[PDB]
Design a protein around this nucleic acid. Structure first.
Ligand SMILES: [Mg+2]
Ligand SMILES: [Mg+2]
Ligand SMILES: [Mg+2]
Ligand SMILES: [Mg+2]
Ligand SMILES: [Mg+2]
Ligand SMILES: [Mg+2]
Ligand SMILES: [Mg+2]
Ligand SMILES: [Mg+2]
Ligand SMILES: [Mg+2]
Ligand SMILES: [Mg+2]
Ligand SMILES: [Mg+2]
Ligand SMILES: [Mg+2]
Ligand SMILES: [Mg+2]
Ligand SMILES: [Mg+2]
Ligand SMILES: [Mg+2]
Ligand SMILES: [Mg+2]
Ligand SMILES: [Mg+2]
Ligand SMILES: [Mg+2]
Ligand SMILES: [Mg+2]
Ligand SMILES: [Mg+2]
Ligand SMILES: [Mg+2]
Ligand SMILES: [Mg+2]
Length: 61
RNA sequence: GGCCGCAAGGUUAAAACUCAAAUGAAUUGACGGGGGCCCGCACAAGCGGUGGAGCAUGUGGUUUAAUUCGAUGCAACGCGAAGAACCUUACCUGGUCUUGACAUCCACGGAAGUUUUCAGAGAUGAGAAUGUGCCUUCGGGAACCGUGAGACAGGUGCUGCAU
RNA sequence: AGGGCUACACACGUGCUACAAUGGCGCAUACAAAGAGAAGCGACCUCGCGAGAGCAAGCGGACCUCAUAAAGUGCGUCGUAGUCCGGAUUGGAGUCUGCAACUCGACUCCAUGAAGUCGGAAUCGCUAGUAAUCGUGGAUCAGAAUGCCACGGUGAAUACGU
RNA sequence: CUUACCACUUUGUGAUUCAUGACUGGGGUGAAGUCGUAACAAGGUAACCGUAGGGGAACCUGCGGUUGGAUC
RNA sequence: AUAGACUGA
RNA sequence: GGAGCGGUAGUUCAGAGAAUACCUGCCUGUCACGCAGGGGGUCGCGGGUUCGAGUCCCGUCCGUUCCGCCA
C-alpha cells in the first residue's frame, strides 16, 4: 500500500473540549501539509464538538 | 443462614474489595432566583447615533516566496504605529561578508583626508590622481584609516509562568 | 538590489460621507479662540481655469507669515425627482515632494456618475455651555489623516422616581 | 470344629464443606464520553424519615411525623 | 409563568 | 411465481413545499436555549407520448405488503 491513498482518522481523547480543539488544530495542519504536497483533500466525516473543536474527523488524502 | 408474616417485608447479622480520610462545633471571606439601607447616565424621561449603502482604518480567516512580531470579554480590534514608495523593516527571493555592520585590545603598515575613471542592479571590486598634514621631550607621536591575530563582539532569538 | 507588510470567495470593530427643501448651487455681507515657523512660515506682484510656478519683503516673532473661519444673515434659483441629492468607480491631461509615486502618495482640471430614499434582531454616548452641529490649529512628517491631541462659534430636550 | 467380640471391606440415604459452572443480581475504581440537574442559598416545588404507587435516571406523587428550614 | 451546564496540571 | 402500494431538500412527510436539519448575524463570561436573516432537491434509473412530464405511459433496480392450496 505504499502508493495507495491514505485515510486519516483523528479522534479527541483526554482533555475534553481542549482535546477536541487540539484535534481540530491537528487536522488543519494535516490538510495544509497535504495541500503543500499537492495531495487531494476530502472531508469524509466530522462530528463537531459540543463546545469547540471536532470530536472525530475522517479525511481522505 | 435462622425465626416471624397471607404478602409487602421485619428481626439477628457478615466477608471479600476499596480510600486515607469520613465527621462534629466554631471562625474569616465569597456567594444566594435571602432580608434591610444606599450610590453611579445603571435603569426610568429625553436627544443623537451604530447594525442597512459607499469609502477609510484595524482584526480574524483565506491566499502567498513573504503577506514581520505583539495586543484577544468588559480591560484586543483608528491598539504598540505621534504617520510601510526607498529607509523605517525586524519578512521573502537573490547576490555577497565572516574577531565581523557595531566595541575594547596586541603587533605591523599607513597621516587623515580630497577628487577621477572603472565592472557590477547594488553590496563590492579594480584602479588613477591629489595632497601626506598637526602637538611635537622634534623625541614622540596624537588622531584617523587598513592588515594579521584572538580574547570577544552580535541576536527585534525563546520563556512576561524566573524578573 | 528587488518584492511584501497595501495580497482578497468572506466575518467583525471603530470612523468619514450620504440618502436632501431645518437643503444643493450662484452672488453679497458679519462675528472666534488656540498654535507653529529658520535645511522653516512665506507676504506683495506676475503667470496658469485650477493644483501651483517665477520673482521677492517681513519674521527666531503681542511686530511678519501661516490665515478669506464656517455654521449665520440678505437676494436668486432648484420644487419632491435617484433629482441642479449623493460622489463611489473609471478614462484622459497635469502639479508637488522625493534618487525614484508601477506594485504603493497627496492634490488639481475635463469627462462618467454606483449604491444609498433613514436601515431586522440587536446595540452605544450624553444631565449644561453638556448633547447635536460648524469650522481652526498641533505632534509624527522631504511627501503621505475621515485617526490622535487641543481650540473656539451656535446651542437644546429631559430626569415623576429607585 | 463351633459360638461371642471385633479390624479391613461393602450397600442405601442424609448432613456439612471446598473447588468449579452457561447465565444472571447488585457493589467498588475511572485525569476524557452520552442524558439530564436531584442535594448544598428559600438550590429556584424547603429538606429529611417511615410507607405505597409510578417513572430512562437522578427522582415524582399520596398519608403521617421532624426541624437537622430561610423570609415574615 | 419560563429559565439548564462550566472536563482534565 | 401472481395481485397492489410506493421511491421528491441531509432525514421524515406534501405536491417542487412543510417539519427537523445546516449556514450567517445577534443575546451570553462561553455553550445550550432563544431572536433575526438565508440557502439547500429538479423528483430512484432509463426510455416513449406530449408544444409541454416530478406528474401521463412502458421497461428496470429498489423497498413494502397479501396469496402461492387440495390430494
Ligand atoms: Mg434474612
Ligand atoms: Mg434609557
Ligand atoms: Mg455599516
Ligand atoms: Mg497582525
Ligand atoms: Mg516576541
Ligand atoms: Mg520596505
Ligand atoms: Mg532594503
Ligand atoms: Mg504577568
Ligand atoms: Mg499593517
Ligand atoms: Mg495606500
Ligand atoms: Mg509664538
Ligand atoms: Mg451634487
Ligand atoms: Mg436604488
Ligand atoms: Mg453625572
Ligand atoms: Mg502641522
Ligand atoms: Mg506631513
Ligand atoms: Mg466644540
Ligand atoms: Mg435542583
Ligand atoms: Mg428543592
Ligand atoms: Mg407521579
Ligand atoms: Mg411523634
Ligand atoms: Mg451535561
Amino acid at each position: 500500500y505504499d502508493s495507495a491513498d491514505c485515510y486519516l482518522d483523528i479522534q479527541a481523547g483526554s482533555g475534553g473540549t481542549e482535546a477536541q480543539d487540539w484535534a481540530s488544530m491537528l487536522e488543519r495542519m494535516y490538510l495544509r501539509w497535504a495541500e503543500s504536497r499537492g495531495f487531494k483533500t476530502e472531508i469524509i466525516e466530522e462530528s463537531e464538538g459540543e463546545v469547540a473543536g471536532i470530536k472525530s474527523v475522517t479525511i481522505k488524502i
